[PDB]
Design an enzyme around this catalytic site. Structure first.
Site, PDB file in Angstrom:
ATOM      1  N   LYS A 185      23.670   3.567 -37.345  1.00  0.00           N
ATOM      2  CA  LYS A 185      23.646   3.616 -35.868  1.00  0.00           C
ATOM      3  C   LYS A 185      24.959   4.128 -35.347  1.00  0.00           C
ATOM      4  CE  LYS A 185      21.724   0.321 -32.969  1.00  0.00           C
ATOM      5  NZ  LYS A 185      22.713  -0.500 -32.176  1.00  0.00           N
ATOM      6  N   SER A 205      29.066   2.494 -33.111  1.00  0.00           N
ATOM      7  CA  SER A 205      28.412   2.229 -31.847  1.00  0.00           C
ATOM      8  C   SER A 205      29.045   0.977 -31.225  1.00  0.00           C
ATOM      9  CB  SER A 205      26.916   2.030 -32.088  1.00  0.00           C
ATOM     10  OG  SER A 205      26.310   3.295 -32.305  1.00  0.00           O
TER      11      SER A 205
END
Ligand SMILES: [Fe+3]
Length: 321
Positions: A69, A255
């Site tokens: 991610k 992230s």
């Protein structure tokens, strides 16, 4: 401080030269971590072992997926400063003379920059699927590309499941068809070197490859593109002849706990200090002899930040694969 994820020892040096250059002009600090592949840098970025790495848009995909991610924080800016662009074009340069147009492609020889890379794989093999002879999964796309070209050089591929996707490659020993700079037909320059060396009939790469590698004008007059409309035009007119417009390579980060702002400030400052034509000491958008695109793309001018929480699938734009 920012641990940058280097992808090889040439890249590592560039980064160690970077860090020494940042200290000398007392800017934001950079650190270097070495790992051996893009996919190996992602994981370390994901596992708090390091924080940024410039990736191609194929690896922006696989880095946004679970459990990584990761997120694009800064896009590479290519071109000229009068007209900056945060995108590039996938073209297919070929040897001038031949009659074959984009549609006539079967049973020839192709040089590809990398397996799963944007310009040298995703776009052309995405453009050639109607022509491709492929039923769908769980057979990979690799098998059909093995049967569509008589031999190619698509590094990163399996030497045993698909031997002619590597057939043209020139790395010696176990280094043939590897996703490293020790494959001399790896990436843009190597995909171009594979057409320039008479090895393949087609080179799937970017629009500046020819302007970048071939310095003397007359040499380039002997190369041409392949238009998606089935014509062929000169390499200076890639804006009306290309496979696609693809978004620029980007620094990707975590992230959560990404350090974005710190990563943004290291870059910003280094671009001001070691940018195009800025310091005679360090060129952050430059590599030494024989080596190419270490850390960042050569002859790129700077960066343009990615706006808040633009995921990996929104950076690339919708309309992929
Ligand atoms: Fe690329």
């Amino acid at each position: 401080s920012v641990q940058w994820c280097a992808v090889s020892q040439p890249e590592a040096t560039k980064c160690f030269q970077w860090q020494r250059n940042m200290r000398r002009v007392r800017g934001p600090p950079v650190s270097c971590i070495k790992r051996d592949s893009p996919i190996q840098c992602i994981q370390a970025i994901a596992e708090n072992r390091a924080d940024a790495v410039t990736l191609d848009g194929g690896f922006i995909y696989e880095a946004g997926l679970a459990p990584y991610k990761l997120r694009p924080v800064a896009a590479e800016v290519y071109g000229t400063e009068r007209q900056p662009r945060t995108h590039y074009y996938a073209v297919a340069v070929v040897k001038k003379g031949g009659s074959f147009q984009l549609n006539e492609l079967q049973g020839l020889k192709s040089c590809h920059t990398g397996l799963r890379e944007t310009a040298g794989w995703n776009v052309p093999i995405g453009t050639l699927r109607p022509f491709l002879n492929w039923t769908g999964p769980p057979e990979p796309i690799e098998a059909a590309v093995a049967r569509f070209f008589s031999a190619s050089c698509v590094p990163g591929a399996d030497k045993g499941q698909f031997p002619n996707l590597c057939r043209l490659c020139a790395g010696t020993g176990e280094n043939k068809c590897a996703f490293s700079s020790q494959e001399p037909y790896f990436s843009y320059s190597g995909a171009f070197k594979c057409l320039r060396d008479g090895a393949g009939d087609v080179a799937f790469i970017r629009e500046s490859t020819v302007f970048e590698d071939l310095s003397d004008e007359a040499e380039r007059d002997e190369y041409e593109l392949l238009c998606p409309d089935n014509t062929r035009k000169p390499v200076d007119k890639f804006k009306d002849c290309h496979l696609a417009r693809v978004p620029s390579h980007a620094v990707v980060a975590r992230s959560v706990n990404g350090k974005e702002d710190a990563i943004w400030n290291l870059l910003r400052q280094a671009q001001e200090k070691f940018g195009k034509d800025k310091s005679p000491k360090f060129q952050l958008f430059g590599s030494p002899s024989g080596q190419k695109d270490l850390l960042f793309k050569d002859s790129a001018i700077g960066f343009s930040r990615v706006p808040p929480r633009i995921d990996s699938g929104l950076y690339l734009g919708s309309g992929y694969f």
